[PDB]
Short mmCIF file of C-alpha atoms (C1' of nucleotides) in Angstrom, two decimals:
data_model
loop_
_atom_site.label_atom_id
_atom_site.label_comp_id
_atom_site.label_asym_id
_atom_site.label_seq_id
_atom_site.Cartn_x
_atom_site.Cartn_y
_atom_site.Cartn_z
CA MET A 1 4.79 30.63 47.91
CA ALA A 2 6.85 33.03 45.76
CA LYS A 3 5.38 33.56 42.34
CA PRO A 4 7.43 31.88 39.44
CA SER A 5 10.22 33.87 37.88
CA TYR A 6 8.34 34.30 34.57
CA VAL A 7 5.51 36.08 36.43
CA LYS A 8 5.16 39.76 35.48
CA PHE A 9 1.86 40.69 37.05
CA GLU A 10 -0.62 39.42 39.64
CA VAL A 11 -3.97 38.30 38.29
CA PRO A 12 -7.08 38.71 40.48
CA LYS A 13 -9.21 35.69 41.33
CA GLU A 14 -12.17 36.96 39.32
CA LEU A 15 -9.94 37.62 36.30
CA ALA A 16 -8.39 34.14 36.38
CA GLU A 17 -11.90 32.67 36.71
CA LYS A 18 -12.98 34.74 33.66
CA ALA A 19 -9.96 33.57 31.77
CA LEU A 20 -10.89 29.92 32.47
CA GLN A 21 -14.53 30.60 31.51
CA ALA A 22 -13.31 32.17 28.23
CA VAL A 23 -11.17 29.00 27.72
CA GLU A 24 -14.29 26.83 28.20
CA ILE A 25 -16.40 29.01 25.86
CA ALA A 26 -13.62 29.05 23.25
CA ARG A 27 -13.45 25.25 23.41
CA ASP A 28 -17.20 24.93 23.02
CA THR A 29 -17.90 27.64 20.36
CA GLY A 30 -14.45 28.55 19.12
CA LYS A 31 -10.88 27.20 18.91
CA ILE A 32 -8.23 26.67 21.56
CA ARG A 33 -4.86 25.17 20.97
CA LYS A 34 -3.97 22.89 23.92
CA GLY A 35 -0.43 22.50 25.04
CA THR A 36 2.46 24.97 25.10
CA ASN A 37 4.03 23.68 21.87
CA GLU A 38 0.99 24.63 19.77
CA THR A 39 0.61 27.75 21.90
CA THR A 40 4.08 28.93 20.81
CA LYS A 41 3.43 27.80 17.22
CA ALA A 42 0.20 29.80 16.94
CA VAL A 43 1.65 32.87 18.74
CA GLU A 44 4.55 32.72 16.29
CA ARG A 45 1.99 32.33 13.50
CA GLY A 46 0.17 35.18 15.21
CA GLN A 47 -3.21 33.41 15.24
CA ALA A 48 -3.60 33.58 19.09
CA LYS A 49 -5.93 36.21 20.52
CA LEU A 50 -5.15 35.30 24.13
CA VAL A 51 -2.76 33.02 26.04
CA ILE A 52 -3.61 31.33 29.28
CA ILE A 53 -0.64 30.14 31.32
CA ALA A 54 -0.47 27.93 34.35
CA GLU A 55 1.21 29.08 37.55
CA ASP A 56 1.86 25.80 39.36
CA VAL A 57 4.12 24.34 36.66
CA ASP A 58 7.10 22.61 38.39
CA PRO A 59 9.50 22.98 35.38
CA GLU A 60 9.24 26.70 34.74
CA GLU A 61 11.20 26.36 31.51
CA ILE A 62 7.98 25.14 29.89
CA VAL A 63 6.29 28.50 30.48
CA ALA A 64 9.41 30.73 30.91
CA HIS A 65 9.15 31.75 27.22
CA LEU A 66 5.45 32.69 27.08
CA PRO A 67 5.36 36.17 28.74
CA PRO A 68 8.20 37.85 26.80
CA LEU A 69 7.13 36.19 23.47
CA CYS A 70 3.58 37.47 24.07
CA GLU A 71 4.79 40.96 24.85
CA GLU A 72 6.93 40.66 21.71
CA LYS A 73 4.10 39.71 19.49
CA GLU A 74 1.48 41.95 21.20
CA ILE A 75 -0.76 38.96 22.02
CA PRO A 76 -2.26 39.44 25.52
CA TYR A 77 -1.47 36.67 27.98
CA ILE A 78 -3.13 35.78 31.29
CA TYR A 79 -2.40 33.45 34.18
CA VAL A 80 -4.44 30.78 35.95
CA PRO A 81 -3.61 29.45 39.46
CA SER A 82 -3.61 25.76 38.42
CA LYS A 83 -2.93 23.72 35.29
CA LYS A 84 -5.54 21.23 36.40
CA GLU A 85 -8.10 23.99 36.11
CA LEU A 86 -6.73 24.87 32.70
CA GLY A 87 -7.08 21.26 31.58
CA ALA A 88 -10.65 21.18 32.98
CA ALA A 89 -11.45 24.43 31.15
CA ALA A 90 -9.96 22.95 27.93
CA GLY A 91 -11.77 19.59 28.33
CA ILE A 92 -8.75 17.33 28.47
CA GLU A 93 -7.88 15.02 31.35
CA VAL A 94 -4.19 15.77 31.28
CA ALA A 95 -3.18 19.05 32.96
CA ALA A 96 -3.15 21.71 30.21
CA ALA A 97 0.00 23.71 30.93
CA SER A 98 -1.04 26.54 28.61
CA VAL A 99 -3.89 27.28 26.14
CA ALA A 100 -3.92 29.58 23.09
CA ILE A 101 -7.31 31.03 22.06
CA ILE A 102 -7.36 31.21 18.25
CA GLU A 103 -11.12 31.66 17.83
CA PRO A 104 -12.66 33.15 20.98
CA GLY A 105 -16.06 32.04 19.62
CA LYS A 106 -18.58 33.30 22.26
CA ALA A 107 -15.72 34.39 24.59
CA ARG A 108 -14.96 37.52 22.46
CA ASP A 109 -16.59 39.99 24.88
CA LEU A 110 -14.87 38.20 27.75
CA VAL A 111 -11.48 38.05 25.97
CA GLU A 112 -11.81 41.72 24.79
CA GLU A 113 -12.57 42.43 28.43
CA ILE A 114 -9.89 40.09 29.75
CA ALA A 115 -7.25 41.51 27.47
CA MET A 116 -8.28 45.03 28.69
CA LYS A 117 -8.05 43.64 32.25
CA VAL A 118 -4.71 42.15 31.23
CA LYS A 119 -3.75 45.48 29.70
CA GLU A 120 -4.08 47.11 33.03
CA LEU A 121 -1.96 44.49 34.81
CA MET A 122 1.48 45.24 33.29
CA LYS A 123 0.80 48.95 33.73
CA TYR B 6 4.26 -2.13 2.02
CA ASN B 7 0.94 -3.87 2.56
CA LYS B 8 -0.41 -3.06 -0.89
CA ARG B 9 -0.40 -5.91 -3.43
CA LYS B 10 1.64 -5.13 -6.52
CA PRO B 11 -0.47 -4.20 -9.59
CA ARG B 12 -0.77 -7.22 -11.86
CA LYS B 13 -2.42 -6.47 -15.17
CA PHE B 14 -1.46 -9.97 -16.48
CA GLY B 15 -1.36 -13.45 -15.01
CA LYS B 16 -3.62 -15.54 -12.86
CA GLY B 17 -3.30 -12.92 -10.10
CA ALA B 18 -4.73 -10.14 -12.27
CA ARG B 19 -8.20 -11.63 -12.59
CA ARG B 20 -10.35 -12.64 -9.59
CA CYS B 21 -13.86 -14.04 -9.56
CA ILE B 22 -16.53 -11.51 -8.94
CA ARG B 23 -18.59 -13.73 -6.70
CA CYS B 24 -16.24 -16.09 -4.85
CA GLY B 25 -12.92 -14.30 -5.53
CA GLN B 26 -10.97 -17.36 -6.44
CA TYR B 27 -7.85 -16.85 -8.57
CA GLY B 28 -8.38 -20.07 -10.59
CA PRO B 29 -10.71 -20.65 -13.58
CA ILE B 30 -12.50 -17.49 -14.60
CA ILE B 31 -14.64 -17.31 -17.74
CA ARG B 32 -14.12 -14.09 -19.71
CA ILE B 33 -16.40 -14.54 -22.69
CA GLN B 34 -17.70 -11.03 -23.28
CA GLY B 35 -17.07 -9.93 -19.67
CA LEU B 36 -18.31 -12.35 -17.05
CA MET B 37 -15.49 -12.60 -14.55
CA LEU B 38 -16.99 -15.53 -12.78
CA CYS B 39 -15.49 -18.66 -11.23
CA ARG B 40 -16.36 -21.82 -13.08
CA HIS B 41 -18.15 -23.10 -9.97
CA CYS B 42 -19.90 -19.69 -9.65
CA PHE B 43 -21.21 -19.88 -13.20
CA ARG B 44 -23.52 -22.82 -12.67
CA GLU B 45 -25.61 -21.26 -9.98
CA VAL B 46 -26.19 -17.91 -11.83
CA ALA B 47 -26.49 -19.03 -15.49
CA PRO B 48 -30.25 -19.47 -15.25
CA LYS B 49 -30.50 -16.02 -13.72
CA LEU B 50 -28.44 -14.60 -16.60
CA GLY B 51 -31.04 -16.10 -18.95
CA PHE B 52 -29.01 -19.21 -20.03
CA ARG B 53 -31.07 -22.21 -21.05
CA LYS B 54 -30.15 -25.73 -21.80
CA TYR B 55 -30.72 -27.28 -25.22
CA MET C 1 -34.63 11.02 -49.81
CA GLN C 2 -33.59 10.04 -46.30
CA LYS C 3 -34.04 6.65 -44.66
CA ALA C 4 -34.26 5.82 -40.93
CA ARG C 5 -32.82 2.34 -39.88
CA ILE C 6 -34.13 0.71 -36.72
CA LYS C 7 -32.18 -2.26 -35.24
CA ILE C 8 -34.23 -4.26 -32.72
CA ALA C 9 -32.26 -6.82 -30.66
CA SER C 10 -33.72 -9.06 -27.96
CA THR C 11 -33.49 -12.49 -26.45
CA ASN C 12 -37.26 -12.83 -26.20
CA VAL C 13 -38.77 -13.62 -29.58
CA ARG C 14 -42.33 -12.59 -28.70
CA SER C 15 -41.32 -9.18 -27.38
CA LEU C 16 -39.36 -8.57 -30.57
CA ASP C 17 -42.38 -9.51 -32.64
CA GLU C 18 -44.64 -7.27 -30.52
CA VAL C 19 -42.36 -4.21 -31.08
CA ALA C 20 -42.03 -4.94 -34.74
CA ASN C 21 -45.76 -5.28 -35.12
CA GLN C 22 -46.25 -2.01 -33.25
CA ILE C 23 -43.88 -0.19 -35.63
CA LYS C 24 -45.66 -1.86 -38.59
CA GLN C 25 -49.08 -0.76 -37.40
CA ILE C 26 -47.76 2.73 -36.81
CA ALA C 27 -46.37 2.66 -40.40
CA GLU C 28 -49.49 2.35 -42.58
CA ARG C 29 -51.50 4.46 -39.99
CA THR C 30 -48.99 7.27 -40.77
CA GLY C 31 -49.08 6.27 -44.51
CA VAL C 32 -45.32 6.15 -44.99
CA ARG C 33 -43.31 3.49 -46.85
CA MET C 34 -41.95 1.11 -44.31
CA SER C 35 -39.71 -1.74 -45.54
CA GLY C 36 -40.67 -5.01 -43.91
CA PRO C 37 -38.75 -6.32 -40.90
CA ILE C 38 -35.78 -8.37 -42.18
CA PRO C 39 -34.72 -10.90 -39.60
CA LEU C 40 -30.95 -10.92 -39.51
CA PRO C 41 -29.00 -14.02 -38.29
CA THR C 42 -29.72 -14.84 -34.62
CA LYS C 43 -26.44 -14.77 -32.62
CA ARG C 44 -25.80 -17.88 -30.51
CA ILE C 45 -23.61 -17.47 -27.51
CA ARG C 46 -22.43 -20.89 -26.26
CA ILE C 47 -20.48 -21.73 -23.10
CA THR C 48 -19.29 -25.23 -22.24
CA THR C 49 -18.24 -25.89 -18.60
CA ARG C 50 -17.42 -28.99 -16.58
CA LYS C 51 -20.28 -30.06 -14.34
CA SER C 52 -18.07 -31.50 -11.58
CA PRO C 53 -17.08 -28.81 -8.98
CA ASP C 54 -14.23 -31.08 -8.00
CA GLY C 55 -12.08 -33.24 -10.28
CA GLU C 56 -13.19 -36.69 -9.33
CA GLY C 57 -15.34 -39.03 -11.34
CA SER C 58 -16.37 -39.06 -14.98
CA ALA C 59 -15.71 -35.95 -17.04
CA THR C 60 -19.05 -34.40 -17.99
CA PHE C 61 -19.82 -31.03 -19.63
CA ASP C 62 -22.79 -28.67 -19.67
CA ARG C 63 -23.42 -26.34 -22.60
CA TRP C 64 -25.41 -23.22 -21.80
CA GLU C 65 -26.77 -21.04 -24.57
CA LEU C 66 -28.17 -17.56 -25.33
CA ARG C 67 -29.99 -16.95 -28.59
CA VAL C 68 -30.21 -13.21 -29.23
CA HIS C 69 -32.48 -12.28 -32.12
CA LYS C 70 -32.27 -9.17 -34.28
CA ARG C 71 -34.61 -7.52 -36.81
CA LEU C 72 -33.99 -4.57 -39.18
CA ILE C 73 -36.73 -2.12 -40.01
CA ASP C 74 -36.11 0.59 -42.58
CA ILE C 75 -38.66 3.44 -42.81
CA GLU C 76 -38.80 6.62 -44.86
CA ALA C 77 -38.45 10.28 -43.86
CA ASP C 78 -41.64 11.84 -42.31
CA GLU C 79 -41.17 13.70 -39.10
CA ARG C 80 -44.63 12.56 -38.01
CA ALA C 81 -43.74 8.97 -38.72
CA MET C 82 -40.50 9.05 -36.74
CA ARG C 83 -42.11 11.10 -33.98
CA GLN C 84 -44.43 8.25 -33.05
CA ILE C 85 -41.62 5.87 -32.06
CA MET C 86 -40.23 7.24 -28.82
CA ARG C 87 -43.83 7.08 -27.59
CA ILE C 88 -43.76 3.29 -28.11
CA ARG C 89 -43.76 1.29 -24.89
CA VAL C 90 -40.62 -0.86 -25.21
CA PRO C 91 -40.02 -3.93 -22.98
CA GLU C 92 -36.89 -4.10 -20.90
CA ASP C 93 -35.35 -7.05 -22.69
CA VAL C 94 -35.69 -5.37 -26.12
CA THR C 95 -33.08 -2.80 -27.20
CA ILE C 96 -33.76 -0.47 -30.12
CA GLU C 97 -31.08 1.52 -31.85
CA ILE C 98 -32.15 4.02 -34.51
CA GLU C 99 -29.79 5.66 -37.00
CA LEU C 100 -30.27 7.84 -40.03
CA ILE C 101 -28.76 6.94 -43.42
CA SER C 102 -28.88 9.44 -46.30
CA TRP D 5 8.77 24.44 23.23
CA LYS D 6 12.40 23.74 24.24
CA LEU D 7 13.21 24.90 20.69
CA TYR D 8 12.31 28.51 21.58
CA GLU D 9 14.90 30.40 23.66
CA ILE D 10 14.18 34.06 24.46
CA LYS D 11 16.74 36.83 25.21
CA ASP D 12 16.25 40.61 25.62
CA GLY D 13 12.55 40.27 24.68
CA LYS D 14 13.16 38.59 21.31
CA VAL D 15 12.84 34.88 20.57
CA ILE D 16 15.88 33.05 19.24
CA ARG D 17 15.12 29.62 17.85
CA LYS D 18 17.47 26.57 18.03
CA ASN D 19 16.69 25.47 14.49
CA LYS D 20 15.83 27.00 11.09
CA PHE D 21 12.42 27.34 9.49
CA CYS D 22 11.95 25.08 6.51
CA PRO D 23 10.89 27.28 3.51
CA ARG D 24 8.94 24.60 1.70
CA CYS D 25 5.93 24.55 4.06
CA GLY D 26 6.34 27.86 5.86
CA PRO D 27 6.69 28.27 9.63
CA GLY D 28 5.91 25.62 12.22
CA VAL D 29 8.47 23.16 10.90
CA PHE D 30 11.70 22.76 12.88
CA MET D 31 14.29 20.61 11.14
CA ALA D 32 17.55 18.96 11.97
CA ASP D 33 20.69 20.84 12.90
CA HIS D 34 23.17 18.13 12.00
CA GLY D 35 26.10 20.62 12.24
CA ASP D 36 27.14 20.01 8.61
CA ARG D 37 23.73 20.66 7.12
CA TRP D 38 20.28 21.99 7.73
CA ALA D 39 18.34 18.80 6.97
CA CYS D 40 14.55 18.85 6.75
CA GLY D 41 12.95 15.64 7.78
CA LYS D 42 9.37 16.51 6.80
CA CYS D 43 10.28 15.76 3.19
CA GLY D 44 14.05 15.15 3.11
CA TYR D 45 14.95 18.61 1.95
CA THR D 46 18.61 19.45 2.81
CA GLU D 47 20.38 22.83 2.70
CA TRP D 48 24.01 22.18 3.41
CA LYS D 49 25.68 24.79 5.62
CA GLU E 5 44.83 -13.91 -22.73
CA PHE E 6 41.01 -13.76 -22.57
CA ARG E 7 39.14 -12.78 -25.75
CA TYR E 8 35.46 -11.99 -26.29
CA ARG E 9 34.27 -11.68 -29.87
CA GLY E 10 37.80 -10.77 -30.93
CA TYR E 11 38.30 -8.20 -28.01
CA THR E 12 40.13 -8.56 -24.70
CA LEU E 13 38.83 -7.74 -21.24
CA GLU E 14 40.57 -4.34 -21.19
CA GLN E 15 39.42 -3.68 -24.74
CA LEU E 16 35.93 -4.64 -23.51
CA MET E 17 36.40 -2.12 -20.69
CA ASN E 18 36.52 0.94 -22.93
CA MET E 19 33.53 -0.01 -25.10
CA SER E 20 30.31 1.91 -24.58
CA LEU E 21 27.35 0.03 -23.24
CA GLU E 22 25.60 -0.04 -26.67
CA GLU E 23 28.66 -1.33 -28.51
CA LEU E 24 29.31 -3.73 -25.60
CA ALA E 25 25.77 -5.06 -25.78
CA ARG E 26 26.18 -5.46 -29.57
CA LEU E 27 28.67 -8.20 -28.68
CA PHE E 28 26.11 -9.88 -26.38
CA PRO E 29 23.55 -12.38 -27.79
CA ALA E 30 20.08 -11.25 -28.74
CA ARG E 31 18.58 -12.16 -25.35
CA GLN E 32 21.07 -10.19 -23.23
CA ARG E 33 21.44 -7.31 -25.69
CA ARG E 34 17.68 -6.91 -25.95
CA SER E 35 17.36 -7.15 -22.15
CA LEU E 36 19.93 -4.29 -21.82
CA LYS E 37 18.13 -2.26 -24.51
CA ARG E 38 14.89 -2.70 -22.56
CA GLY E 39 16.68 -1.18 -19.56
CA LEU E 40 17.91 -2.64 -16.29
CA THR E 41 15.54 -2.84 -13.38
CA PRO E 42 15.73 -0.14 -10.71
CA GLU E 43 16.90 -2.80 -8.34
CA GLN E 44 19.45 -3.84 -10.88
CA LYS E 45 20.56 -0.21 -11.12
CA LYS E 46 20.93 0.01 -7.33
CA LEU E 47 23.08 -3.16 -7.46
CA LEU E 48 25.06 -1.50 -10.24
CA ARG E 49 25.62 1.51 -7.99
CA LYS E 50 26.74 -0.91 -5.24
CA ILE E 51 29.20 -2.78 -7.35
CA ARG E 52 30.62 0.35 -8.96
CA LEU E 53 31.23 1.95 -5.55
CA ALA E 54 32.88 -1.30 -4.51
CA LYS E 55 35.22 -1.18 -7.54
CA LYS E 56 36.14 2.35 -6.50
CA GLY E 57 36.76 1.08 -2.92
CA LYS E 58 34.17 3.28 -1.25
CA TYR E 59 31.73 0.33 -0.73
CA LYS E 60 33.53 -2.08 1.64
CA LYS E 61 30.52 -4.32 2.44
CA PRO E 62 30.66 -8.01 1.32
CA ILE E 63 28.26 -7.51 -1.57
CA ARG E 64 25.15 -9.61 -1.75
CA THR E 65 22.35 -9.68 -4.36
CA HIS E 66 18.99 -11.14 -5.32
CA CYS E 67 19.04 -10.11 -8.95
CA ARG E 68 19.69 -13.48 -10.56
CA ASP E 69 18.76 -11.82 -13.86
CA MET E 70 21.60 -9.26 -13.64
CA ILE E 71 23.62 -9.99 -16.81
CA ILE E 72 27.33 -10.09 -16.07
CA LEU E 73 29.29 -7.38 -17.89
CA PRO E 74 33.11 -6.99 -18.09
CA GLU E 75 32.86 -4.40 -15.27
CA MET E 76 31.81 -7.03 -12.70
CA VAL E 77 34.93 -9.10 -13.35
CA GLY E 78 37.18 -9.69 -10.42
CA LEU E 79 34.64 -9.07 -7.65
CA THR E 80 33.02 -11.52 -5.21
CA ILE E 81 29.23 -11.23 -5.00
CA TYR E 82 26.72 -13.45 -3.12
CA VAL E 83 23.54 -14.35 -5.07
CA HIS E 84 20.47 -15.54 -3.15
CA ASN E 85 19.77 -19.05 -4.40
CA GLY E 86 16.43 -18.95 -2.47
CA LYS E 87 17.73 -19.91 1.01
CA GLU E 88 21.11 -18.28 1.34
CA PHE E 89 23.48 -16.04 -0.65
CA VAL E 90 25.80 -18.47 -2.48
CA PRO E 91 29.14 -16.70 -3.22
CA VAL E 92 30.53 -16.28 -6.77
CA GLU E 93 33.81 -14.73 -7.94
CA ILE E 94 33.56 -13.20 -11.39
CA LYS E 95 36.28 -14.39 -13.83
CA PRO E 96 36.49 -12.73 -17.27
CA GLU E 97 34.75 -15.70 -18.95
CA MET E 98 31.23 -14.92 -17.54
CA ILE E 99 30.84 -11.85 -19.87
CA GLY E 100 27.49 -12.52 -21.67
CA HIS E 101 25.70 -14.47 -18.94
CA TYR E 102 23.17 -14.12 -16.12
CA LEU E 103 23.99 -14.28 -12.48
CA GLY E 104 21.44 -16.94 -11.81
CA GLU E 105 23.32 -19.40 -14.00
CA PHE E 106 26.10 -19.55 -11.37
CA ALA E 107 23.89 -19.54 -8.22
CA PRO E 108 22.79 -23.18 -7.75
CA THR E 109 19.37 -23.55 -6.10
CA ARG E 110 18.53 -27.29 -6.61
CA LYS E 111 20.64 -29.84 -4.82
CA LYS E 112 22.06 -32.98 -6.32
CA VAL E 113 19.55 -35.87 -6.69
CA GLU E 114 20.93 -39.41 -6.40
CA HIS E 115 19.08 -42.69 -6.44
CA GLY E 116 18.58 -45.11 -3.56
CA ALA E 117 16.27 -48.06 -3.03
CA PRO E 118 12.71 -47.46 -4.29
CA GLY E 119 10.04 -47.21 -1.64
"C1'" U F 1 16.09 -36.90 -4.03
"C1'" U F 2 15.32 -32.24 -2.06
"C1'" A F 3 15.31 -27.17 3.13
"C1'" A F 4 10.86 -27.92 -0.38
"C1'" U F 5 9.39 -30.76 -4.82
"C1'" U F 6 2.13 -28.10 -1.15
"C1'" G F 7 -2.28 -31.69 -0.98
"C1'" G F 8 -6.45 -34.66 -2.91
"C1'" A F 9 -7.51 -38.70 -6.08
"C1'" U F 10 -6.52 -45.64 -6.62
"C1'" U F 11 -10.02 -50.81 -10.94
"C1'" C F 12 -14.69 -50.45 -13.24
"C1'" A F 13 -16.04 -44.72 -11.25
"C1'" A F 14 -7.61 -41.66 -9.77
"C1'" C F 15 -3.35 -40.75 -13.36
"C1'" G F 16 -4.09 -33.87 -20.57
"C1'" C F 17 -8.05 -35.14 -13.20
"C1'" C F 18 -8.89 -30.80 -9.16
"C1'" G F 19 -4.67 -27.40 -11.74
"C1'" G F 20 -9.46 -25.11 -17.09
"C1'" G F 21 -1.81 -23.16 -18.81
"C1'" A F 22 2.80 -22.15 -12.02
"C1'" A F 23 9.00 -16.82 -14.22
"C1'" C F 24 5.99 -12.93 -9.74
"C1'" C F 25 0.96 -13.41 -8.87
"C1'" U F 26 -1.74 -18.85 -8.78
"C1'" C F 27 0.87 -20.39 -3.58
"C1'" A F 28 -1.43 -23.94 0.16
"C1'" C F 29 5.92 -25.99 0.10
"C1'" C F 30 10.86 -24.06 1.64
"C1'" G F 31 14.34 -20.01 3.09
"C1'" G F 32 14.67 -15.00 4.36
"C1'" G F 33 12.61 -10.15 5.33
"C1'" G F 34 8.70 -6.62 6.79
"C1'" G F 35 3.78 -4.97 8.99
"C1'" C F 36 0.11 -5.94 12.14
"C1'" G F 37 -3.29 -8.07 15.96
"C1'" A F 38 -11.04 -4.96 15.52
"C1'" C F 39 -13.35 -3.56 20.04
"C1'" G F 40 -13.42 -3.37 25.63
"C1'" G F 41 -10.63 -3.46 30.63
"C1'" C F 42 -5.25 -2.55 33.31
"C1'" A F 43 -1.65 1.39 32.52
"C1'" G F 44 -0.31 5.64 29.41
"C1'" G F 45 -1.83 10.12 27.00
"C1'" A F 46 -0.66 15.57 24.69
"C1'" U F 47 5.12 16.91 28.03
"C1'" G F 48 3.45 15.13 21.58
"C1'" A F 49 2.92 10.70 17.25
"C1'" A F 50 1.17 6.09 16.32
"C1'" G F 51 3.58 7.36 10.76
"C1'" G F 52 7.17 9.16 7.40
"C1'" C F 53 11.78 11.44 6.78
"C1'" C F 54 17.32 13.15 4.73
"C1'" A F 55 23.57 11.36 5.23
"C1'" G F 56 24.89 6.69 5.89
"C1'" G F 57 25.59 1.41 8.07
"C1'" C F 58 23.30 -2.94 8.19
"C1'" U F 59 19.46 -4.58 4.90
"C1'" G F 60 19.07 -8.52 -1.95
"C1'" A F 61 16.43 -3.49 -1.10
"C1'" A F 62 12.59 -1.73 1.88
"C1'" G F 63 13.22 5.47 8.25
"C1'" G F 64 12.42 -2.29 7.95
"C1'" U F 65 16.70 -1.64 11.64
"C1'" C F 66 19.72 1.66 14.03
"C1'" U F 67 23.56 6.97 14.27
"C1'" U F 68 21.53 11.66 13.83
"C1'" G F 69 17.87 14.97 14.47
"C1'" C F 70 12.97 16.89 12.11
"C1'" C F 71 8.29 16.65 11.45
"C1'" G F 72 3.50 14.99 11.66
"C1'" G F 73 0.08 18.46 15.00
"C1'" A F 74 -2.82 14.28 16.92
"C1'" C F 75 -4.36 10.31 21.32
"C1'" G F 76 -2.23 5.30 20.84
"C1'" C F 77 3.21 1.24 23.58
"C1'" G F 78 2.79 -3.06 26.55
"C1'" C F 79 -0.66 -7.08 29.47
"C1'" C F 80 -5.78 -9.39 30.03
"C1'" G F 81 -10.81 -10.52 27.78
"C1'" A F 82 -11.62 -10.97 22.79
"C1'" G F 83 -10.37 -10.66 17.97
#
RNA sequence: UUAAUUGGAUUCAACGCCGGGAACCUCACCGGGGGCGACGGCAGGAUGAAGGCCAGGCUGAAGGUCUUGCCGGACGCGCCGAG
């Protein structure tokens, strides 16, 4: 299983789990924008503090624009091995292709860590 | 589109307070009551027969 | 000299008489000239309506009435005298309106 | 999201931003005009 | 030739709306002074675009109250009588009259055997 | 008679009666147009509106309808029970 073309770094299992946990915590006690349209809208608006992107998305054009945009706007972005897991972390039955944390809520320490652990990935 | 047009005048303008009928409404000093509705509440209002 | 004019309007006759008597009894206790209660005309609201809810049968009419009575009490200027009138217990059906004429 | 192309690390966008309500509003590229369908605003090309 | 208050149809053409209405009776002139309805104004836009050729649709209408002016002359318009749009063609002689006058809505009543 | 003149009322006790005022409204008639149908289940969802929107055509007109494409940033097509 070759990684999708938009992939720029390999996320460890623990780091993906922490990203999903931050998504859950930001849903509960913060704000997460669900769906890639609102993800791009917030990242363009600059209100996103982290971007979680699925890896098993069959049409890669949905998430082909998220890595370079995120590197353009200096908003850290992280990957998760499944969009079903991202929908579960976001509390929506449909598979959440991507999630944009606006208010980390009680995930701040995680996101601040995750971003740092994202900041070592492209290095 | 579903909003009734605003009628200040005409039979449609005034509706009975109690039963809402668009027909006979008594407006002597601000009742807004259907003529049927008046008979059952006149004693409550203090009206007496003489 | 300054005069205080009190209009007392009510459907109930006896409540009107009670309030007027209360003001009167306050008057000579306070020792201030108090012109006697003048009973103005009693206004008679009359409403005539057909009895029949439907249209069938003989045409019959019912005439309902309100008689609202009104008395005028003029009193002279003494702050003690006009202080003792907000303390009056006033029944619900009686309405008092007090103005001040030079 | 299909209205966001990206080339050489910068995002090109297939339509204009409507100035009346700031970003987040794509609006019609009719060829002859930049027509905004949030309120009917139209800037003819 | 056709004359209206001592003026011809083409003479009527060049008169301003106020002077034109001054030839109308009190009812129509005062209706005009009070202002046409917005729907009447939309119909006026329609008929004026038709007279310039841009508006090629067979022109209908509901505004029975639209008072005929000299500018409607020579055009076919279909007024709603309540069930369908009866057609009328505007000759010069309808200047000073309402559309609803020429849009029949009640059928002819004739008399048969009593019940 | 009418597409329609909405219905009730039949002597005493139906016929300036319900209608106690019909240009709209009243309105229940007729013609035409437009929007729905609470709340549950089946299915969908958000991948984005269900609602509005320029330029038009239809449409009396009404982004109602469609060409066109936006929003709108949020869950509501269709069938069944039931409203």
